[PDB]
């Protein structure tokens, strides 16, 4: 039951973990763990309303997080992505996106994180081309260091922060045309 | 049409705004921004234009992401410090991005892209059409995922 003299202690970890279950009433999850080649782990596939994003931790592609040297053991992961892309129509555009953390670049040839990220995304794009993706469906982008995923306090988080993302989308304009036709017809301005 | 004349220079350079279903594209001709099509030296004359674009950006919904896209015609580069169309297009986009940052656009909302000589706006069949392909395009979008979340919830409840 209870002591006859009840003296509550300070709020503790029991009370933290009980209230540490708070979350959104409508908890939807638009990410799934992805498996490249039945052996390529830590990747995720995310859906957003304008497209799909395949997120690849640094270590699935590059020999390190401050280099654009593709780890040759990982060439087969890029081949698998190329194969799947070749199963999409030529309508689909593929944007390879590079990201870095805040690691100092003085020991490398890179002068900026934007530059490092650009070279990483470019190299991945070029390997996709080697494996047959039409260059007319590809582009590369750099975000530099300012879109982190997690604090940079573990190897796993560092690999996420230095990820490459592959974004799949189209340039559909049917709704835009519809509005344009209506606007031209009805707006005096 | 989904393309409309965008008045920037007011000198008939050819700037245009296009709407597509997942965002907006401001298209800026080479001559507007750059000293030539073979390099990334911005026209100091036109810093005014990028500044204007930076001001307008800070009026948009806070969820907006801005991607500055670089493109080239498919003519050889044989003369300069640039070793590929991808590299030249990346540098041109980078420079426009950096000016936007200089005029107050948050770096967290900015990225730059290169398409090299792919995805031409006009066939590379005439001198003037080639030059059109040296434009920069600024794409405005968001990473909205409400619909995606809706579907995931329904799928989780009814599929598994």
Curated annotation (Swiss-Prot), chain B:
One of its GO terms (molecular function) is identical protein binding. Residues 21-144 form the OmpA-like domain. It is a single-pass type II membrane protein. It comes from the Bacteria. Keywords: Cell inner membrane, Cell membrane, Chemotaxis, Flagellar rotation, Membrane, Transmembrane, Transmembrane helix. GO terms for cellular component: bacterial-type flagellum stator complex. The keyword Iron does not apply. Residues 1-160 are periplasmic. It is found in: Cell inner membrane. The keyword GTP-binding does not apply. One of its GO terms (biological process) is chemotaxis. Its main location: membrane. MotA and MotB comprise the stator element of the flagellar motor complex. Required for the rotation of the flagellar motor. Might be a linker that fastens the torque-generating machinery to the cell wall. Each stator complex is composed of 4 MotA and 2 MotB subunits. 2 A subunits and 1 B subunit are thought to form a single ion channel, so that each stator complex contains two channels. Belongs to the MotB family. This is Motility protein B.
